[PDB]
């Protein structure tokens, strides 16, 4: 079930890139806590912040809309 969660796409991208959550916060332009809530999948990033996320996380919004995190396993 699921078609990947934005939050786990972030949690995954971020570790793959090796970015500290506070640094990601600074890159995107949010408080570290907002990152935390996003990955913990309480809040969801909206258009602008989603773009800023995608940029900070070295990808297109497409990546997170779809899940371009690998190339197998529910097209992770």
Short mmCIF file of N, CA and C in Angstrom, two decimals:
data_model
loop_
_atom_site.label_atom_id
_atom_site.label_comp_id
_atom_site.label_asym_id
_atom_site.label_seq_id
_atom_site.Cartn_x
_atom_site.Cartn_y
_atom_site.Cartn_z
N UNK A 1 0.86 -1.19 0.00
CA UNK A 1 0.00 0.00 0.00
C UNK A 1 0.89 1.24 0.00
N UNK A 2 0.29 2.43 -0.07
CA UNK A 2 0.98 3.71 -0.25
C UNK A 2 1.59 3.80 -1.66
N UNK A 3 1.91 5.02 -2.09
CA UNK A 3 2.70 5.30 -3.29
C UNK A 3 3.82 6.25 -2.86
N UNK A 4 4.55 5.81 -1.83
CA UNK A 4 5.60 6.52 -1.12
C UNK A 4 5.07 7.79 -0.43
N UNK A 5 5.65 8.13 0.72
CA UNK A 5 5.28 9.31 1.50
C UNK A 5 6.35 10.38 1.28
N UNK A 6 5.92 11.61 0.97
CA UNK A 6 6.78 12.79 0.86
C UNK A 6 7.84 12.78 1.97
N UNK A 7 7.39 12.59 3.21
CA UNK A 7 8.25 12.62 4.37
C UNK A 7 9.40 11.61 4.27
N UNK A 8 9.11 10.37 3.87
CA UNK A 8 10.15 9.37 3.74
C UNK A 8 11.00 9.60 2.49
N UNK A 9 10.43 10.12 1.39
CA UNK A 9 11.25 10.62 0.28
C UNK A 9 12.28 11.62 0.80
N UNK A 10 11.86 12.60 1.61
CA UNK A 10 12.78 13.57 2.21
C UNK A 10 13.82 12.83 3.05
N UNK A 11 13.38 12.06 4.05
CA UNK A 11 14.25 11.33 4.97
C UNK A 11 15.30 10.51 4.23
N UNK A 12 14.90 9.94 3.09
CA UNK A 12 15.76 9.15 2.22
C UNK A 12 16.71 10.02 1.39
N UNK A 13 16.19 10.95 0.57
CA UNK A 13 16.99 11.91 -0.19
C UNK A 13 18.07 12.51 0.70
N UNK A 14 17.63 13.06 1.83
CA UNK A 14 18.46 13.80 2.75
C UNK A 14 19.65 12.95 3.22
N UNK A 15 19.42 11.68 3.59
CA UNK A 15 20.52 10.82 4.00
C UNK A 15 21.40 10.44 2.81
N UNK A 16 20.78 10.17 1.65
CA UNK A 16 21.52 9.84 0.43
C UNK A 16 22.49 10.99 0.10
N UNK A 17 22.03 12.23 0.23
CA UNK A 17 22.82 13.44 0.03
C UNK A 17 23.73 13.73 1.23
N UNK A 18 23.36 13.23 2.42
CA UNK A 18 24.11 13.30 3.67
C UNK A 18 23.98 14.69 4.31
N UNK A 19 22.79 15.29 4.25
CA UNK A 19 22.55 16.66 4.73
C UNK A 19 21.98 16.60 6.15
N UNK A 20 22.59 17.31 7.11
CA UNK A 20 22.03 17.41 8.46
C UNK A 20 20.71 18.18 8.44
N UNK A 21 19.73 17.76 9.25
CA UNK A 21 18.36 18.23 9.17
C UNK A 21 18.28 19.75 9.37
N UNK A 22 19.05 20.27 10.32
CA UNK A 22 19.18 21.70 10.53
C UNK A 22 19.76 22.40 9.30
N UNK A 23 20.78 21.80 8.66
CA UNK A 23 21.34 22.39 7.45
C UNK A 23 20.28 22.41 6.35
N UNK A 24 19.54 21.30 6.17
CA UNK A 24 18.44 21.28 5.22
C UNK A 24 17.47 22.42 5.53
N UNK A 25 17.07 22.55 6.80
CA UNK A 25 16.25 23.67 7.26
C UNK A 25 16.78 25.00 6.73
N UNK A 26 18.06 25.29 6.99
CA UNK A 26 18.69 26.51 6.50
C UNK A 26 18.65 26.61 4.97
N UNK A 27 18.98 25.54 4.24
CA UNK A 27 18.99 25.53 2.78
C UNK A 27 17.61 25.89 2.23
N UNK A 28 16.58 25.18 2.70
CA UNK A 28 15.21 25.39 2.25
C UNK A 28 14.72 26.77 2.69
N UNK A 29 15.09 27.17 3.91
CA UNK A 29 14.63 28.39 4.54
C UNK A 29 13.43 28.09 5.44
N UNK A 30 13.54 27.03 6.25
CA UNK A 30 12.59 26.72 7.31
C UNK A 30 13.36 26.43 8.60
N UNK A 31 12.67 26.51 9.74
CA UNK A 31 13.17 26.01 11.00
C UNK A 31 13.34 24.49 10.92
N UNK A 32 14.43 23.95 11.47
CA UNK A 32 14.70 22.52 11.62
C UNK A 32 13.44 21.74 11.99
N UNK A 33 12.66 22.25 12.94
CA UNK A 33 11.44 21.59 13.38
C UNK A 33 10.48 21.36 12.21
N UNK A 34 10.32 22.33 11.31
CA UNK A 34 9.45 22.16 10.15
C UNK A 34 9.90 20.96 9.33
N UNK A 35 11.21 20.85 9.04
CA UNK A 35 11.77 19.65 8.42
C UNK A 35 11.31 18.41 9.19
N UNK A 36 11.51 18.41 10.51
CA UNK A 36 11.12 17.29 11.36
C UNK A 36 9.64 16.92 11.15
N UNK A 37 8.74 17.90 11.22
CA UNK A 37 7.31 17.67 11.03
C UNK A 37 7.00 17.15 9.63
N UNK A 38 7.63 17.72 8.60
CA UNK A 38 7.55 17.22 7.23
C UNK A 38 7.97 15.75 7.16
N UNK A 39 9.18 15.38 7.59
CA UNK A 39 9.59 13.98 7.47
C UNK A 39 8.72 13.05 8.31
N UNK A 40 8.41 13.46 9.54
CA UNK A 40 7.48 12.74 10.40
C UNK A 40 6.05 12.74 9.83
N UNK A 41 5.81 13.47 8.73
CA UNK A 41 4.59 13.40 7.94
C UNK A 41 3.38 13.89 8.74
N UNK A 42 3.58 14.96 9.52
CA UNK A 42 2.50 15.71 10.15
C UNK A 42 2.04 16.78 9.16
N UNK A 43 2.90 17.77 8.95
CA UNK A 43 2.73 18.80 7.94
C UNK A 43 3.19 18.26 6.58
N UNK A 44 2.79 18.93 5.50
CA UNK A 44 3.22 18.66 4.13
C UNK A 44 3.71 20.00 3.56
N UNK A 45 4.82 20.04 2.81
CA UNK A 45 5.30 21.25 2.16
C UNK A 45 4.38 21.62 1.00
N UNK A 46 4.02 22.91 0.87
CA UNK A 46 3.25 23.42 -0.25
C UNK A 46 4.17 23.98 -1.32
N UNK A 47 3.60 24.23 -2.50
CA UNK A 47 4.28 24.53 -3.76
C UNK A 47 5.67 25.17 -3.62
N UNK A 48 5.73 26.39 -3.10
CA UNK A 48 6.98 27.13 -2.97
C UNK A 48 7.97 26.32 -2.12
N UNK A 49 7.54 25.90 -0.93
CA UNK A 49 8.40 25.19 0.01
C UNK A 49 8.79 23.83 -0.55
N UNK A 50 7.89 23.19 -1.29
CA UNK A 50 8.14 21.93 -1.98
C UNK A 50 9.23 22.15 -3.04
N UNK A 51 9.14 23.21 -3.84
CA UNK A 51 10.19 23.56 -4.78
C UNK A 51 11.51 23.80 -4.04
N UNK A 52 11.49 24.61 -2.98
CA UNK A 52 12.68 24.91 -2.19
C UNK A 52 13.30 23.62 -1.63
N UNK A 53 12.46 22.73 -1.09
CA UNK A 53 12.84 21.39 -0.67
C UNK A 53 13.54 20.67 -1.80
N UNK A 54 12.87 20.55 -2.95
CA UNK A 54 13.40 19.81 -4.09
C UNK A 54 14.77 20.34 -4.48
N UNK A 55 14.91 21.66 -4.55
CA UNK A 55 16.17 22.32 -4.86
C UNK A 55 17.22 21.96 -3.80
N UNK A 56 16.93 22.19 -2.52
CA UNK A 56 17.87 21.88 -1.44
C UNK A 56 18.28 20.41 -1.45
N UNK A 57 17.31 19.57 -1.75
CA UNK A 57 17.43 18.13 -1.90
C UNK A 57 17.78 17.76 -3.34
N UNK A 58 18.43 18.65 -4.10
CA UNK A 58 19.08 18.35 -5.37
C UNK A 58 18.21 17.48 -6.29
N UNK A 59 16.99 17.93 -6.59
CA UNK A 59 16.06 17.23 -7.46
C UNK A 59 14.92 18.15 -7.90
N UNK A 60 14.07 17.65 -8.79
CA UNK A 60 12.85 18.28 -9.27
C UNK A 60 11.67 17.84 -8.39
N UNK A 61 10.60 18.65 -8.29
CA UNK A 61 9.42 18.30 -7.50
C UNK A 61 8.86 16.95 -7.93
N UNK A 62 8.90 16.69 -9.24
CA UNK A 62 8.65 15.42 -9.91
C UNK A 62 9.12 14.23 -9.06
N UNK A 63 10.35 14.31 -8.54
CA UNK A 63 10.96 13.26 -7.73
C UNK A 63 10.05 12.88 -6.57
N UNK A 64 9.48 13.88 -5.92
CA UNK A 64 8.75 13.75 -4.68
C UNK A 64 7.27 13.53 -4.95
N UNK A 65 6.74 14.15 -6.01
CA UNK A 65 5.41 13.82 -6.51
C UNK A 65 5.35 12.32 -6.82
N UNK A 66 6.29 11.82 -7.62
CA UNK A 66 6.26 10.44 -8.08
C UNK A 66 6.87 9.51 -7.03
N UNK A 67 8.08 9.83 -6.57
CA UNK A 67 8.97 8.90 -5.89
C UNK A 67 10.01 8.42 -6.90
N UNK A 68 11.13 9.15 -6.98
CA UNK A 68 12.24 8.77 -7.86
C UNK A 68 13.45 8.44 -7.00
N UNK A 69 13.25 7.59 -6.00
CA UNK A 69 14.20 7.36 -4.93
C UNK A 69 15.06 6.13 -5.21
N UNK A 70 14.55 5.17 -5.98
CA UNK A 70 15.32 4.09 -6.59
C UNK A 70 14.66 3.74 -7.94
N UNK A 71 14.63 2.46 -8.33
CA UNK A 71 14.10 2.02 -9.61
C UNK A 71 13.65 0.56 -9.52
N UNK A 72 12.93 0.24 -8.45
CA UNK A 72 12.38 -1.06 -8.12
C UNK A 72 11.49 -0.81 -6.91
N UNK A 73 10.85 -1.86 -6.41
CA UNK A 73 10.09 -1.89 -5.16
C UNK A 73 9.07 -0.75 -5.12
N UNK A 74 7.89 -0.96 -5.71
CA UNK A 74 6.85 0.05 -5.90
C UNK A 74 7.42 1.33 -6.53
N UNK A 75 8.39 1.15 -7.45
CA UNK A 75 9.16 2.22 -8.07
C UNK A 75 9.52 3.28 -7.03
N UNK A 76 10.27 2.86 -6.01
CA UNK A 76 10.48 3.60 -4.78
C UNK A 76 10.83 5.06 -5.06
#
